[PDB]
Amino acid sequence: MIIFSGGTGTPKLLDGLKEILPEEELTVVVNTAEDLWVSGNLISPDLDTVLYLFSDQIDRKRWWGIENDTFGTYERMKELGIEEGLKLGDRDRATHIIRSNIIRDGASLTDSTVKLSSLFGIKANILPMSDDPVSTYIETAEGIMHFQDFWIGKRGEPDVRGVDIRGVSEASISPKVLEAFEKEENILIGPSNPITSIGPIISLPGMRELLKKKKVVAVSPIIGNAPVSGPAGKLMPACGIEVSSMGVAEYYQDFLDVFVFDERDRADEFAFERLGCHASRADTLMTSTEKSKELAEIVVQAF
Amino acid sequence: MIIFSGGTGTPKLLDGLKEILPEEELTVVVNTAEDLWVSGNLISPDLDTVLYLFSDQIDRKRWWGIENDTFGTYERMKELGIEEGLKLGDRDRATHIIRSNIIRDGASLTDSTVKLSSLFGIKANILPMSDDPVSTYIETAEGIMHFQDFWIGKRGEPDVRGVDIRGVSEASISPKVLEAFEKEENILIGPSNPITSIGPIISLPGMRELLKKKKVVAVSPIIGNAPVSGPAGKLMPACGIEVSSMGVAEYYQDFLDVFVFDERDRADEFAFERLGCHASRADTLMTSTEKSKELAEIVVQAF
């Protein structure tokens, strides 16, 4: 099956999905609207997370970066009081160095994503959403600037006014994604930021039309309870969607077949019906590889 | 005074020169024909050596890199069997990152060399020979390629045919070097590779003419005894100079005032006279900060 992933929701569900079916049959399409050239090397936060996942080297404490990694190059900056802009792991930088060398040498992102997968021995198909650049900018009253600055800089306090998934219009769906996007038929959108993570992916030209020809299942990245309190909270009304597990479903009401939401919010399920799509219940609060495998079987069984 | 430095000879004499006179009066002009963009960051091997010297952080075991440095980012490559091309220290990379960020941001090399000096608290004037790119290539029978490949790749075994200090013709002497190159009058060429280290510096347009208007003192980078057995051995006949402490002096017979050679080779000193320049004796075998300070006072007294 194919899994649209990004942020931190999906890779968590993968960690369980991988223990439910043969790796070979798994192919995750990672968002690239987050990539950014840092300290002289392209960093694909989302891509690296998946790679580090299927390579048993993901830091399971913070679900980003590499377990037991060292930060000698970083700390230097610290001592010198030079805020690099991110706490890069020495081992996690090597990745940035490798994929960058491939790219600096006329290669493509998708090319590097594979070569890495080989050095890591990953047997699953992990591919970026495209080879063409695409960066997620935020338009607000306090001016326009990279998503990194907005949340990982201003603690995510500023206002909103519209998100510009710049470059996406001219972006072309990776060829290797289209290639795998044939034999398959079961598409799944992980529980992650629908605007900034999955949005870019589906915004790609032709993509939306494609998913309409497959069996798509998505897992709500928002539970009921109190307000979202998440980074998509203020990115919901600025795009035109209501901050609710409902708005999420109505954002994919153009190709979404089976939708899954937490047993928590027992909201008006008849409302999700107003979108003409199946609906099921499952605990999306993954707090363990076990608990996660639990949600994984439901997705599988949801197909 | 001004000190032309590079390679590993000069920085060794500096370590002693710095303990003989106030740092403020010291200004070393470092060779840049060795710089090279690695893993996404410009590395000035010679410049960094001097910086790490006057910053009490030079690895005194291997006289290159940083004492007690870590190599976590490197070793990763190792494990993956990816020969990066050089063993970069995590702490030594931060330097490459910093100076590169300055440069990537419209700044100049000389600019970065200063900012670094500030973060390091260096009170001496350490400046690159130029802001314009210049790389030392080697022409041989086995083809033409970077100096790095020739020695740090082929163990320095290939033949020769001529050295091309590419880009040097169009290169312009750093403005800050010319600025300091006024008030001063005592120029010193350290005991280092005369072809690949100092050569590039003096090859700069106008430079040779300039030194002819100052009091220049140089220390032979070659002692008598058995054959040179050094990286300049085969780079001596290919340029047109004899592999001897004599050829070295005759290479600067256009501005060299006082020449200094090791007490070792008691060669025909009357031969150095045939170049119309002063000649003195001193142990150039620096095996300690002390032993080095010894040669330092002689240079000072040689002026």
Side-chain angles (χ1 to χ4, degrees):
Chain A
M1 65 167 314
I2 294 183
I3 308 102
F4 270 37
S5 180
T8 324
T10 316
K12 211 143 297 190
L13 169 57
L14 291 188
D15 170 53
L17 234 176
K18 73 171 193 170
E19 326 264 47
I20 217 58
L21 33 62
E23 272 193 49
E24 295 66 62
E25 296 158 354
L26 289 168
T27 176
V28 301
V29 209
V30 187
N31 163 69
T32 62
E34 288 279 63
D35 310 324
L36 191 50
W37 283 89
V38 177
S39 302
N41 291 96
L42 164 51
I43 301 178
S44 286
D46 309 296
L47 196 42
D48 291 357
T49 310
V50 204
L51 264 47
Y52 299 159
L53 195 220
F54 289 98
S55 297
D56 301 311
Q57 71 170 308
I58 174 98
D59 184 319
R60 295 183 159 288
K61 248 45 182 170
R62 315 158 168 55
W63 277 75
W64 76 270
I66 295 177
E67 165 181 30
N68 314 335
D69 192 309
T70 330
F71 303 87
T73 298
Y74 170 77
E75 298 183 2
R76 183 68 257 265
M77 316 279 263
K78 204 177 171 191
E79 294 182 354
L80 300 166
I82 305 300
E83 213 285 297
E84 187 180 357
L86 216 162
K87 199 192 185 204
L88 303 168
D90 300 324
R91 311 181 62 63
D92 168 58
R93 164 176 281 116
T95 301
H96 307 166
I97 316 279
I98 280 146
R99 92 140 67 62
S100 282
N101 286 305
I102 310 302
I103 289 171
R104 266 181 292 255
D105 293 49
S108 161
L109 183 63
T110 326
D111 308 0
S112 65
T113 321
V114 186
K115 177 61 198 288
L116 266 167
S117 293
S118 302
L119 289 125
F120 291 146
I122 307 181
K123 291 197 310 299
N125 197 209
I126 300 179
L127 320 181
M129 50 166 260
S130 164
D131 305 13
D132 310 327
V134 187
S135 54
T136 320
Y137 281 113
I138 305 306
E139 314 172 311
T140 64
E142 288 187 49
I144 321 80
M145 32 86 109
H146 217 79
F147 177 63
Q148 248 279 185
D149 315 345
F150 173 87
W151 184 274
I152 309 173
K154 282 63 181 188
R155 235 99 316 182
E157 300 160 308
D159 312 311
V160 303
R161 192 176 303 256
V163 56
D164 174 42
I165 182 58
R166 199 172 299 168
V168 79
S169 299
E170 304 54 54
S172 315
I173 315 172
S174 172
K176 290 213 60 60
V177 166
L178 298 126
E179 270 164 46
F181 226 100
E182 287 218 4
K183 303 171 299 294
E184 297 288 2
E185 83 308 357
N186 287 330
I187 306 306
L188 162 66
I189 301 174
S192 56
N193 319 295
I195 59 301
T196 51
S197 287
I198 317 303
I201 313 176
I202 52 89
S203 255
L204 273 165
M207 181 61 79
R208 197 179 290 263
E209 176 67 67
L210 216 45
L211 308 160
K212 280 190 290 181
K213 309 184 184 173
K214 296 295 181 71
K215 206 168 186 56
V216 199
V217 162
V219 183
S220 179
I222 304 166
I223 320 173
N225 304 39
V228 293
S229 182
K234 30 282 180 55
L235 289 167
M236 223 87 164
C239 304
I241 300 284
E242 69 160 308
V243 192
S244 168
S245 107
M246 191 64 254
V248 183
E250 84 160 304
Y251 187 66
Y252 308 133
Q253 61 182 171
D254 193 43
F255 52 96
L256 170 62
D257 303 341
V258 188
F259 189 63
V260 194
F261 33 74
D262 207 358
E263 307 169 307
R264 236 70 62 168
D265 65 330
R266 270 179 297 300
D268 194 30
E269 56 168 47
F270 191 85
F272 299 69
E273 306 298 282
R274 306 174 221 158
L275 303 186
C277 82
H278 273 49
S280 33
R281 296 279 175 135
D283 189 90
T284 68
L285 195 76
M286 294 154 293
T287 54
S288 163
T289 305
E290 255 300 73
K291 196 82 179 311
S292 176
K293 185 208 303 175
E294 203 150 46
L295 169 59
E297 285 193 3
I298 295 190
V299 185
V300 150
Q301 172 77 61
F303 279 110
Chain B
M1 65 167 314
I2 294 183
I3 308 102
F4 270 37
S5 180
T8 324
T10 316
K12 211 143 297 190
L13 169 57
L14 291 188
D15 170 53
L17 234 176
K18 73 171 193 170
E19 326 264 47
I20 217 58
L21 33 62
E23 272 193 49
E24 295 66 62
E25 296 158 354
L26 289 168
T27 176
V28 301
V29 209
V30 187
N31 163 69
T32 62
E34 288 279 63
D35 310 324
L36 191 50
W37 283 89
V38 177
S39 302
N41 291 96
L42 164 51
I43 301 178
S44 286
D46 309 296
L47 196 42
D48 291 357
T49 310
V50 204
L51 264 47
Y52 299 159
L53 195 220
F54 289 98
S55 297
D56 301 311
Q57 71 170 308
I58 174 98
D59 184 319
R60 295 183 159 288
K61 248 45 182 170
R62 315 158 168 55
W63 277 75
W64 76 270
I66 295 177
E67 165 181 30
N68 314 335
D69 192 309
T70 330
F71 303 87
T73 298
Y74 170 77
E75 298 183 2
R76 183 68 257 265
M77 316 279 263
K78 204 177 171 191
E79 294 182 354
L80 300 166
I82 305 300
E83 213 285 297
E84 187 180 357
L86 216 162
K87 199 192 185 204
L88 303 168
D90 300 324
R91 311 181 62 63
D92 168 58
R93 164 176 281 116
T95 301
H96 307 166
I97 316 279
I98 280 146
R99 92 140 67 62
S100 282
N101 286 305
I102 310 302
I103 289 171
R104 266 181 292 255
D105 293 49
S108 161
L109 183 63
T110 326
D111 308 0
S112 65
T113 321
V114 186
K115 177 61 198 288
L116 266 167
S117 293
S118 302
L119 289 125
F120 291 146
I122 307 181
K123 291 197 310 299
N125 197 209
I126 300 179
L127 320 181
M129 50 166 260
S130 164
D131 305 13
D132 310 327
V134 187
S135 54
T136 320
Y137 281 113
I138 305 306
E139 314 172 311
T140 64
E142 288 187 49
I144 321 80
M145 32 86 109
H146 217 79
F147 177 63
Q148 248 279 185
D149 315 345
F150 173 87
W151 184 274
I152 309 173
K154 282 63 181 188
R155 235 99 316 182
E157 300 160 308
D159 312 311
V160 303
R161 192 176 303 256
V163 56
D164 174 42
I165 182 58
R166 199 172 299 168
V168 79
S169 299
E170 304 54 54
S172 315
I173 315 172
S174 172
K176 290 213 60 60
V177 166
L178 298 126
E179 270 164 46
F181 226 100
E182 287 218 4
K183 303 171 299 294
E184 297 288 2
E185 83 308 357
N186 287 330
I187 306 306
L188 162 66
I189 301 174
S192 56
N193 319 295
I195 59 301
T196 51
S197 287
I198 317 303
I201 313 176
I202 52 89
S203 255
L204 273 165
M207 181 61 79
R208 197 179 290 263
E209 176 67 67
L210 216 45
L211 308 160
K212 280 190 290 181
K213 309 184 184 173
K214 296 295 181 71
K215 206 168 186 56
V216 199
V217 162
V219 183
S220 179
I222 304 166
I223 320 173
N225 304 39
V228 293
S229 182
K234 30 282 180 55
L235 289 167
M236 223 87 164
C239 304
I241 300 284
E242 69 160 308
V243 192
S244 168
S245 107
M246 191 64 254
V248 183
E250 84 160 304
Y251 187 66
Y252 308 133
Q253 61 182 171
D254 193 43
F255 52 96
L256 170 62
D257 303 341
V258 188
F259 189 63
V260 194
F261 33 74
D262 207 358
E263 307 169 307
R264 236 70 62 168
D265 65 330
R266 270 179 297 300
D268 194 30
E269 56 168 47
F270 191 85
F272 299 69
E273 306 298 282
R274 306 174 221 158
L275 303 186
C277 82
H278 273 49
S280 33
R281 296 279 175 135
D283 189 90
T284 68
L285 195 76
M286 294 154 293
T287 54
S288 163
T289 305
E290 255 300 73
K291 196 82 179 311
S292 176
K293 185 208 303 175
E294 203 150 46
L295 169 59
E297 285 193 3
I298 295 190
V299 185
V300 150
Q301 172 77 61
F303 279 110

